[PDB]
Scaffold this active site. Structure first.
Site, PDB file in Angstrom:
ATOM      1  N   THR G   1       0.788  -1.215   0.000  1.00 51.51           N
ATOM      2  CA  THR G   1       0.000   0.000   0.000  1.00 51.51           C
ATOM      3  C   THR G   1       0.840   1.296   0.000  1.00 51.51           C
ATOM      4  OG1 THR G   1      -0.714   0.008   2.456  1.00 51.51           O
ATOM      5  CG2 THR G   1      -2.148  -1.184   0.853  1.00 51.51           C
ATOM      6  N   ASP G  17      -4.623   4.683  -1.201  1.00 50.81           N
ATOM      7  CA  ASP G  17      -5.174   3.859  -2.214  1.00 50.81           C
ATOM      8  C   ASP G  17      -6.304   2.946  -1.676  1.00 50.81           C
ATOM      9  OD1 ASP G  17      -3.860   0.684  -2.143  1.00 50.81           O
ATOM     10  OD2 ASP G  17      -2.541   2.250  -1.285  1.00 50.81           O
ATOM     11  N   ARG G  19      -6.761  -0.429  -2.762  1.00 47.76           N
ATOM     12  CA  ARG G  19      -6.550  -1.805  -3.184  1.00 47.76           C
ATOM     13  C   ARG G  19      -6.015  -2.592  -1.903  1.00 47.76           C
ATOM     14  NH1 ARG G  19      -3.567  -3.858  -8.725  1.00 47.76           N
ATOM     15  NH2 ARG G  19      -5.287  -2.475  -9.537  1.00 47.76           N
ATOM     16  N   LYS G  33      -8.718   2.257   3.151  1.00 50.24           N
ATOM     17  CA  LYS G  33      -7.550   1.998   3.979  1.00 50.24           C
ATOM     18  C   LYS G  33      -7.465   3.194   4.952  1.00 50.24           C
ATOM     19  CE  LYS G  33      -5.154  -0.926   3.881  1.00 50.24           C
ATOM     20  NZ  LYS G  33      -5.243  -2.303   4.416  1.00 50.24           N
ATOM     21  N   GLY G  47       1.492  -1.861   5.882  1.00 47.40           N
ATOM     22  CA  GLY G  47       2.194  -2.974   6.431  1.00 47.40           C
ATOM     23  C   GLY G  47       1.263  -4.144   6.416  1.00 47.40           C
ATOM     24  N   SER G 129       4.558   0.480   1.191  1.00 45.88           N
ATOM     25  CA  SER G 129       5.298  -0.221   0.238  1.00 45.88           C
ATOM     26  C   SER G 129       5.680   0.682  -0.845  1.00 45.88           C
ATOM     27  CB  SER G 129       4.513  -1.369  -0.346  1.00 45.88           C
ATOM     28  OG  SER G 129       4.317  -2.477   0.551  1.00 45.88           O
ATOM     29  N   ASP G 166       4.497   1.583  -8.218  1.00 48.85           N
ATOM     30  CA  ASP G 166       4.409   0.545  -7.235  1.00 48.85           C
ATOM     31  C   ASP G 166       3.323  -0.327  -7.629  1.00 48.85           C
ATOM     32  OD1 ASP G 166       5.718  -0.455  -4.710  1.00 48.85           O
ATOM     33  OD2 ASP G 166       3.610  -0.502  -3.943  1.00 48.85           O
ATOM     34  N   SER G 169      -0.052  -1.095  -4.986  1.00 47.41           N
ATOM     35  CA  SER G 169      -1.234  -0.235  -4.826  1.00 47.41           C
ATOM     36  C   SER G 169      -1.830  -0.063  -6.176  1.00 47.41           C
ATOM     37  CB  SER G 169      -0.956   1.187  -4.217  1.00 47.41           C
ATOM     38  OG  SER G 169       0.099   1.883  -4.837  1.00 47.41           O
TER      39      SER G 169
END
EC number: 3.4.25.1
Lengths: 247, 245, 126, 232, 241, 195, 226, 204, 244
Positions: G1, G17, G19, G33, G47, G129, G166, G169
């Site tokens: 994420t 995000d 996802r 989130k 995480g 991430s 990335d 996400s």
């Protein structure tokens, strides 16, 4: 020897401590609730006992949850511990098992359960107060309830407690109607409570709050439709005044 | 006074007193005279240690006890109850030493003792303490002298007394302030401490006493506590013998 | 006093609570035991008061402790319940420990032990 | 009044507790002992009392450790406890500090032990008086332990029934036994005299005398039966 | 006297504290369980009423224990609260463990032991609540019991607790018929509550009622708490209103 | 090491267990018993780790028999197997790891039919009419079901268990040194001598 | 994420995000989130997902509770310490990584807190991430003084950028704008960079294409004795 | 590997217009040995339906456990628990053991009684509400089921067509996995009828 | 009356309230001190008599105003043993607060935690209630001037101005009279120094005693600081009154 512990009983049953506990309730000020078909109005008074003492630092009307408020009649200090516990258990016992604020009947029982433990022990006095707890949920509707010193609870259509109990009770019987709105209840509430002190009435000395409709205003946040604002609402000092002008 | 309220140290009378707490000061009266003299550069402790008969081993019996090494305590009242309190005082000091790496300040020492005594007037299964403690010393904040009552109550004192001879003691102590507004430096206060115990003993003129004087002096012991022993003590004896006659 | 607790030895070497426990027994039903040479009969009076009382679902005054040891009891039925449950649990435990069935002597000495323990303390009556 | 003697958590208006004075009385109700000492020896001489003459006495000297030991006066249930703890402190010093525990500090822990039950509800002040003798670094000591916990370093004292007559024997002769040194026999001779004045309606037997001695090069030894027939 | 502790007995060789608790149950209202081979009717009285009392949206002398055992309540409600909650927890603890619903007999036994413990141990109060238990378990069919405050139990074919016990019992055993019918039992109950209770009209809002029947399927039991308006229809049929 | 076998017929459960106990690299005694009865109509054959077999089997024997006495009527097979799964379920999350797999084959008196359960060391009960554990089940889950029909008689099923013994002897490299067979029906539990 | 947190003059914006990924399989395409602690203190989870979602609820019970006990609004500092001391005890065995963002009568505040209990205070923070990915837009367009209008743009370009590089996400960008004195506006599904591609065929089946052994009725409702 | 991967079993649920579908395999496996082919995995407590995938021991104990909490719930409130409220109960039970968690992956399916909205949710080892209203999958073939379901799925399906969509999704995916398959069962929860339909299918 | 229930706090009398707890309201006039606190407008002042009973005492130890924490003062009326004990919890509680909840601890909350603690002591018969009346003073992080009086029952209410002690009624009537005729709850002198002078005037009038400087102890909470004044700092205010 019959009346002088929680552990002792009598040849007429009961405990001395419950009878005396009842007496504690009636020494308190008059507090009342009237259930309507779309709401519940909850009202109490504040007696400052000096012009120096502020009226707002006394909080005799307390949100338990933001759907369930309470008042009391009885001894002032005992109220304060029980409200702190009531919240504390409200979150623990049924907001990590249910994960949202408790239904009215459930919390009524959990609050009732603390009172029950405070009778159960020998060497621990029972509470000085009886509460009225009024609240809302979807499943059992609007509702109104009494939690007495014993550890026992009763659902009520309308009731009153405290010092002004005998005058108020007889008023509440005559004047309740089958169907009524919240708005009309505010006026019936005000008129009943004025029996108890005359010529010291006014919207600064009277604390009045409701569990009525949601207010998405006081929710604190927006753009999420699934959740709702608080059903509980505290009326301000100017709002009490408006309603009092209209009587 | 009335019936009730006595029995347990948690029950109030109407008057707003608690007879048990009152009963604890009464108990110290029967105990043996203690004084404290505060000074601008020291403190002096003196005590009347009654000798019941000529069988006693002289100079081998003390009520003056030490805490850390810079704090004097001397108690009046019941001897062993008094020991217990001083035991606890060592515990208070020791715990402070570990954490903070320094000797207790005197107001720190007074606070923790004052609570321990107060706790033992707070419950139903405890008993009230039966001892007073005149106590104090010298620290990084100068000299201080306190006197702790059996209730859990204390205040600072320039000159303090408790025990049987405490009316003779306070009277003199007050005299000390008038003659000496400067409060007497530590040396002359040893000799003077002696004369007060000799006076206090004209209400204790029954049996003999042993004069034990200790001090803790900034100028003359380097802020540490030590007993006054040997020829210093003798001088203090001889002055007191002279001026009483 | 001096009958106000078990922690009072009394000025006569009698524990009044043990004495009053004894007086308690009388209130319960009669029970008689008779040994033969190839039996024991364990017999009891069975109380009646009404014909609306079941006997179908309701405990008897006799309870099997295991399968070769039995018990009849006299006194308060309420009190006895707890006595009987403990006596039973131990009798099964006996085979947990040794792998033997219980002895008769072992068991009675134990049930008196459980009351004796209760008697000894002052907090609990036997 | 004395409605106050039923709790040890209640004080009197006269600034006492009643239970602690009563615990003092309890010593007197028991046997008799006289302690006395010299600079290089310490001695207890104690009377053994028996229930009847088929009964064979009661051991009144409990050896604490090989440099300390004590006698009892009053109730025995009480004595066994106080002794045990004291022995425990002497063995603790010997293990952890490689020391023979001072008589003065040891007596002082006992005073602190007494106050533990005095303060707290339940338990009682102990109903036995102890005379502890020992020989440390600072030479011979004799301590008188009390129920209260008052601990008193003395050259001679006696507790128990009709003990005022031993203190009169000891008071007259005070300076004489201090000057005795190097001769244990002579401290025993003085003790035998002492415990004679304490008796009423009795006479000393080889099994009434129990004589306890610790000094400089002599460890604690309790003489009994046929070791007290040199000084009978 | 010998009310002074619960862990001391009287020189008579009774226990006054327990006796006293038994008198606690005669300051609360009647509760009647009648067993019939065709069902159990559970009946309870509300001892408090007023015209502003909400009592028509609530059950409070009828508590379901699991899916097949229910109780009626007589006594202190504060006393009742703690033991009902405990009982519900244990009965269903059996369900988890053994994968079968709890037998009626074991659950009463469990709960009567806990009562004896409060008298036996500590400085706790005994509990002055008498519960009539009605269940179904396959090993003895319909099962009825009721519990004393002392901490013991007895079986019954009909029983009454609460106030005016002696009179009520008299009335039941006069008019019992050994086979009975589930309908005739309900009718018997109302007849009896009417007479012991001083509320002469004996209205719906003063009555709680529950019937346990196996009529829902077979081998499957349905416990049905009667709701207020239903309670009003059966008083017309028995003629009381 | 160690076999336990089960097959259920129309009025009986036939449970069988290996005679051998091998502790070390030596067969510790050649002929032994290795089944204990929980109740007079419920049988527990067991196999697993050393001496955890015994302690657990004795634990469960006390506790099921305890309930039987109190109610005055033995538990069913549904209840008994379930109890045992509860115990295993605690034991795998407990400091003490029991590693005992069992078969519970009883007669339900109230239903009037056999019931055969497989209960795993991990703690999972499923009713199965041919189960086993270890490496017994590695050969004989196939063999039974082939020659098994829903209906059987007690004479057939014993002989089919003898067929399964034979397979086991050829292709399993462990000896069992025979097998014991107790037959559990409504008329109790009895030893019947078979190879 | 990916979490980005960015101050402005009148408030703060927190974004994240939508996802939910467990392993390299997308678990849910749309699932928030943003976790709510208090009515004006919001946060984003990264995480280990389970630990973030649980811990905002248990910690959040206290933050709400203190609001009711003190008769004061909840401070953001109240939320930070409760987290920091909470996570500290268990030493990163609750792996919970939060950007806490909010407003108060003390100002606008932004924090990050880490599994082991460590605090970061800047004017832009990012976590996750795609911490690295989102960073570069943030560094090159953060400015001293941002209005509401700009700050919404600063977050949205940064979450979108971290979506693209990335792979962890994706999906929609969720914004929560928190303004001093005012309700916190939850603008979920603000920006759409994932319009679900439509399919060539309808993969719908005839009625009785599956083969079914039997039927049965199970009850989901109460039985009746009537 | 993971104890969850060893024993196996798949659970997949779906949404439609006023319907949810929830299906499972019947396989019980202990490693490569197949134990049972006829043990179900979906249970229900009230009208809220629960699946549980993962290690068998925790799948039966967690069936027992949630039953246990929901029957207390039912009695207390005097009404059946809702899915919405049951989704929180599920996370709470899982979070209560973090450092020795239950190896399972629950799936919740139902339709609310208070609004009639269709409802589904996903879980994980240590549990959190993982919200969708598309589909939820779990199990050893969870990675096959996640893509396989998405192609087939369309929203606003009728209860009878939703059956076709789930059935197809589960069977082919199950087939191409070693520790799943072996017979199936599907519950289609309309509102007040639940039809229970067992899939005839090739054995693995 | 007497039976269960002036000998226990777990035994309710037929009045409804416990007698012994009420005796604690008669046990707070045993030290014979009077406090008057009033609110400024960005400051709070508290002034209590200082009683020196004998010259053998140090006169600067003889205080009853305490530093609790950076922004909190407290004056205790009633016995010393209960004073220290009450004050210790309060200090400790103030410190405990930062670490749980972040920022400094306002007056209201300190007063609530002490009030619940007081209720607890009455709930259990294991301790006696506290013998002291606590009046906590602060200037708040945002709610500014506050006086909070917490009684041993646990009853707590805030104030415009408050007084405490055996002559409490007399300073209370003097205050009503002042605030009612001006029409303002506050005191509208916007420096802290001249509020402290007003406090000195009012106490002088109500008691009928003029006080010297070993006879007053004076604490002042200013916004984001708290300090207690020493005798020569008291002397500036005293000469202010004495020559206007």
């Amino acid at each position: 020897r019959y009346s002088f512990s929680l552990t002792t009983f009598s040849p007429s049953g009961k405990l001395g401590q419950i009878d005396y506990a009842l007496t504690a309730v009636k020494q308190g000020v008059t507090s009342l609730g009237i259930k309507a078909t779309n709401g519940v109005v909850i009202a109490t008074e504040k007696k400052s006992s000096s012009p120096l003492a502020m009226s707002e630092t006394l909080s005799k009307v307390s949100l338990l949850t933001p759907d369930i408020g309470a008042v009391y009649s009885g001894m002032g200090p005992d109220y304060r511990v029980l409200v702190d516990k009531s919240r504390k258990v409200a979150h623990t016992s049924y907001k990590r098992i249910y994960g949202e604020y408790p239904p009215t009947k459930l919390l009524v029982s959990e609050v009732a359960k603390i009172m029950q433990e405070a009778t159960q022990s020998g060497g621990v006095r029972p509470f000085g107060v009886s509460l009225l707890i009024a609240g809302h949920d979807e499943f059992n509707g609007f509702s109104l309830y009494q939690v007495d010193p014993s550890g026992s609870y009763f659902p009520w259509k309308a009731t009153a407690i405290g010092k002004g109990s005998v005058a108020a009770k007889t008023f509440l019987e005559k004047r309740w109607n089958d169907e009524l709105e919240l708005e009309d209840a505010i006026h019936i509430a005000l008129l009943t409570l004025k029996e108890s002190v005359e010529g010291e009435f006014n919207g600064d000395t009277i604390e009045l709050a409701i569990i009525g409709d949601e207010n998405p205003d006081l929710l604190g946040y927006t753009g999420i439709p699934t959740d709702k604002g608080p059903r509980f609402r505290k009326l301000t000092s100017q709002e009490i005044n408006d309603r009092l002008e209209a009587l | 006074i009335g019936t009730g309220y006595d029995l347990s140290n948690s029950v109030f009378s109407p008057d707003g007193r608690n007879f048990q707490v009152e009963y604890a000061v009464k108990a110290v009266e029967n105990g043996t005279t203690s004084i404290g003299i505060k000074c601008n550069d020291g403190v002096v402790f003196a005590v009347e240690k009654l000798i019941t008969s000529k069988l006693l081993v002289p100079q081998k019996n003390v009520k003056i006890q030490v805490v850390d090494r810079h704090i004097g305590c001397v108690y009046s009242g019941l001897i062993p109850d008094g020991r217990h309190l001083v035991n606890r005082g060592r515990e208070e000091a020791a715990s402070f030493k570990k954490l903070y790496k320094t000797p207790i300040p005197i107001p720190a020492f007074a606070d923790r003792l004052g609570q321990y005594v107060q706790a033992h007037t707070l419950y139903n299964s405890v008993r009230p303490f039966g001892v007073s403690t005149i106590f104090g010393g010298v620290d990084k904040n100068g000299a201080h002298l306190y006197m702790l009552e059996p209730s859990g109550s204390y205040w600072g004192y320039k000159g303090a007394a408790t025990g049987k001879g405490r009316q003779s003691a306070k009277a003199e102590l007050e005299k000390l302030v008038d003659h000496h507004p400067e409060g007497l430096s530590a040396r002359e206060a040893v000799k003077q401490a002696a004369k007060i115990i000799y006076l206090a003993h004209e209400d204790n003129k029954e049996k003999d006493f042993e004069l034990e004087i200790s001090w803790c002096s900034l100028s003359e012991t380097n802020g540490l506590h030590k007993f006054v022993k040997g020829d210093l003590l003798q001088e203090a004896i001889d002055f007191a013998q002279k001026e009483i006659n | 006093g001096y009958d106000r607790a078990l922690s009072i030895f009394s000025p006569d070497g009698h524990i009044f609570q043990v004495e009053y426990a004894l007086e308690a027994v009388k209130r319960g039903t009669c029970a008689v035991g008779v040994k033969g040479k190839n039996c024991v009969v364990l017999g009891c009076e069975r109380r009646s008061t009404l014909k609306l009382q079941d006997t179908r679902i309701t405990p008897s005054k006799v309870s099997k402790i295991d399968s070769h040891v039995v018990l009849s009891f006299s006194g308060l039925n309420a009190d006895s319940r707890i006595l009987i449950e403990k006596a039973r649990v131990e009798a099964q435990s006996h085979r947990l420990t040794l792998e033997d069935p219980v002895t008769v002597e072992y068991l009675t000495r134990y049930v008196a032990g459980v009351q004796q323990r209760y008697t000894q303390s002052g907090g609990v009556r036997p | 009044r004395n409605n106050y003697d039923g709790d040890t958590v209640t004080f009197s208006p006269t600034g006492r507790l009643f239970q602690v004075e009563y615990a003092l009385e309890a010593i007197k109700q028991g046997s008799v002992t006289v302690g006395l000492r010299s600079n290089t020896h310490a001695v207890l001489v104690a009377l053994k009392r028996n229930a009847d003459e088929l009964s064979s006495y009661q051991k009144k000297i409990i050896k604490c450790d090989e440099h300390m030991g004590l006698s009892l006066a009053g109730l025995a249930p009480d004595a066994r406890v106080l002794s045990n703890y004291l022995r425990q402190q002497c063995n603790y010093s010997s293990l952890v500090f490689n020391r023979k525990l001072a008589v003065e500090r040891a007596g002082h822990l006992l005073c602190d032990k007494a106050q533990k039950n005095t303060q707290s509800y339940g338990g009682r002040p102990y109903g036995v008086g102890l005379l502890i003798i020992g020989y440390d670094k600072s030479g011979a000591h004799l301590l008188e332990f009390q129920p209260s916990g008052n601990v008193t370093e003395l050259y001679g004292t006696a507790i128990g029934a009709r003990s005022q007559g031993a203190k009169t024997y000891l008071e007259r002769t005070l300076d004489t036994f201090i000057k005795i040194d190097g001769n244990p026999d002579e401290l025993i001779k003085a003790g035998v005299e002492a415990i004679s004045q304490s008796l009423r309606d009795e006479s000393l037997t080889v099994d009434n005398l129990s004589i306890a001695i610790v000094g400089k090069d002599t460890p604690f030894t309790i003489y009994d039966g046929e070791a007290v027939a040199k000084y009978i | 006297r010998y009310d002074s502790r619960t862990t001391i007995f009287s020189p008579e060789g009774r226990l006054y504290q327990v006796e006293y608790a038994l008198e606690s149950i005669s300051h609360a209202g009647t509760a009647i369980g009648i067993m019939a081979s065709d069902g159990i009717v559970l009946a309870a009285e509300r001892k408090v009423t007023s015209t502003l009392l909400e009592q028509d949206t609530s059950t409070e002398k009828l508590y379901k224990l699991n899916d097949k055992i229910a109780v009626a309540v007589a006594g202190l409600t504060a006393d009742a609260e703690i033991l009902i909650n405990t009982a519900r927890i244990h009965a269903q603890n059996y369900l988890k463990t053994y994968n079968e619903d709890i037998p009626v007999e074991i659950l009463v036994r469990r709960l009567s032991d806990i009562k004896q413990g409060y008298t036996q141990h500590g400085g706790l109060r005994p509990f002055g609540v008498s519960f009539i238990y009605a269940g179904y378990d396959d090993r003895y069919g319909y099962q009825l019991y009721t519990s004393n405050p002392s901490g013991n139990y007895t079986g019954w074919k009909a029983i009454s607790v609460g106030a005016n016990t002696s009179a009520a019992q008299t009335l039941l055993q006069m008019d019992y018929k050994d086979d009975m019918k589930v309908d005739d039992a309900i009718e018997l109950a109302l007849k009896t509550l009417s007479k012991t209770t001083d509320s002469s009209a004996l209205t719906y809002d003063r009555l709680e009622f529950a019937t346990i029947r196996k009529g829902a399927n077979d081998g499957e039991v349905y416990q049905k708490i009667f709701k207020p308006q239903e309670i009003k229809d059966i008083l017309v049929k028995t003629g009381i209103t | 090491m160690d076999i336990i076998l089960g097959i259920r017929v129309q009025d009986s459960v036939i449970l069988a267990s290996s005679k051998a106990v091998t502790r070390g690299i030596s067969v510790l005694k050649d002929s032994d018993d290795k089944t204990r009865q929980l109740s007079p109509h419920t049988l527990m054959s067991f196999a697993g780790e050393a001496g955890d077999t015994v302690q657990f089997a004795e634990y469960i024997q006390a506790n099921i028999q305890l309930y039987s006495i109190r109610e005055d009527y033995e538990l069913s097979p549904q209840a008994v197997s379930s109890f045992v799964r509860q115990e295993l379920a605690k034991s795998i999350r407990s400091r003490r790891p029991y590693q005992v797999n069992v078969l519970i084959g009883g007669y339900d008196k109230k239903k009037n039919k056999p019931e055969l359960y497989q209960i795993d060391y991990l703690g999972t009960k499923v009713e199965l009419p041919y189960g086993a554990h270890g490496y017994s089940g590695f050969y004989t889950f196939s063999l039974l079901d082939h020659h098994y029909r829903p209906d059987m008689t007690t004479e057939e099923g014993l002989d089919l268990l003898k067929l399964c013994v034979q397979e086991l002897e050829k292709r399993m490299p462990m000896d069992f040194k025979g097998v014991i067979v107790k037959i559990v029906d409504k008329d109790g539990i009895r030893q019947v001598d078979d190879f | 994420t990916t979490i980005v947190g960015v101050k402005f003059n009148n408030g703060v914006v927190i974004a994240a995000d939508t996802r939910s990924t467990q392993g390299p399989i997308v678990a849910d395409k749309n699932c928030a989130k943003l976790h709510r602690i208090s009515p004006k203190i919001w946060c984003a989870g990264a995480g280990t997902a389970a630990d973030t979602e649980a811990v905002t609820q248990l910690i959040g019970s206290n933050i709400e509770l203190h609001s009711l006990y003190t008769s004061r609004e909840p401070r953001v500092v109240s939320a930070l310490q409760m987290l920091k001391q909470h996570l500290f005890k268990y030493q990163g065995h609750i792996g919970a990584y939060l950007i806490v963002a909010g407003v108060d009568p003390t100002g606008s505040h932004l924090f990050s807190i880490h599994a082991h209990g460590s605090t970061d205070v800047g004017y832009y923070l990012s976590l996750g991430s795609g911490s690295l990915a989102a960073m570069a837009v943030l560094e090159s367009h953060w400015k001293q003084d941002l209005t509401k209008e700009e700050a919404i743009k600063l977050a949205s370009d940064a979450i979108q950028a971290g979506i693209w590089n990335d792979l962890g996400s994706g999906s929609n960008v969720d914004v929560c704008v928190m303004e001093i004195g005012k309700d916190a506006e939850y603008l979920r599904n603000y920006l759409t960079p994932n319009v679900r591609e439509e399919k060539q065929k309808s993969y719908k089946f005839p009625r009785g294409t599956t083969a079914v052994l039997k039927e049965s009725i199970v009850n989901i409702c109460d039985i009746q004795e009537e | 590997s993971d104890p969850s991967s060893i024993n196996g079993g798949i659970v997949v649920a779906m949404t439609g217009k006023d319907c949810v579908a929830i299906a499972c395999d019947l396989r019980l496996g202990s490693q490569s040995l197949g134990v049972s082919n006829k043990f179900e995995k979906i249970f229900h407590y009230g009208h809220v339906f629960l699946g549980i995938t993962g290690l068998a021991t925790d799948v039966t104990t967690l069936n027992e456990m949630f039953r246990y909490k929901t029957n207390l719930y039912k009695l207390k409130e005097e009404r059946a628990i809702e899915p919405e409220t049951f989704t929180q109960l599920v996370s709470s039970s899982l979070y209560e053991r973090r450092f020795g968690p239950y190896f399972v992956g629950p799936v919740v399916a139902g339709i609310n009684s208070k609004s009639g909205k269709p409802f589904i949710a996903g879980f994980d080892l240590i549990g959190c509400i993982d919200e969708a209203k598309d589909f939820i999958v779990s199990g050893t073939a969870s990675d096959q089921l996640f893509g396989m379901c998405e192609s087939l799925y369309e929203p606003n399906l009728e209860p009878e067509d939703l059956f076709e969509t789930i059935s197809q999704a589960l069977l082919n995916a199950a087939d191409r996995d070693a520790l799943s398959g072996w017979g199936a069962v599907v519950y289609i929860i309309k509102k007040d009828e639940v039809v229970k339909r067992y899939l005839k299918m090739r054995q693995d | 009356s007497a039976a269960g229930y002036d000998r226990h706090i777990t035994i309710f009398s037929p009045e409804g309230r416990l007698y012994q707890v009420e005796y604690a309201f008669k046990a707070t006039n045993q030290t014979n001190i009077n406090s008057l606190a009033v609110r400024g407008k960005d400051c709070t002042v508290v002034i209590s008599q200082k009683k020196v009973p004998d010259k053998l005492l140090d006169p600067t130890t003889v205080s009853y105003i305490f530093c609790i924490s950076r922004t909190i003062g407290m004056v205790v009326n009633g016995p010393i043993p209960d004073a220290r004990n009450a004050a210790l919890r309060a200090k400790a509680e103030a410190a405990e607060f930062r670490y749980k909840y972040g920022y400094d601890m306002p007056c209201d909350v300190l007063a609530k935690r002490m009030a619940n603690l007081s209720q607890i002591y009455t709930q259990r018969a294991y301790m006696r209630p506290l013998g002291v009346i606590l009046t906590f003073v602060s200037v708040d992080e945002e709610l500014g001037p506050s006086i909070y009086k917490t009684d041993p029952a646990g009853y707590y209410v805030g104030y415009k101005a408050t007084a405490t002690g055996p002559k409490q009624q007399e300073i209370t009537t003097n205050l009503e009279n002042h605030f009612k005729k001006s029409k303002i709850d506050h005191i509208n002198e916007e420096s802290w120094e001249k509020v402290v002078e007003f406090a000195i005037t009012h106490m002088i009038d109500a008691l009928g005693t003029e006080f010297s400087k070993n006879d007053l102890e004076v604490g002042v909470a200013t916004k984001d600081k708290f300090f207690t004044l020493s005798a020569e700092n008291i002397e500036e205010r005293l000469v202010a009154i004495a020559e206007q």
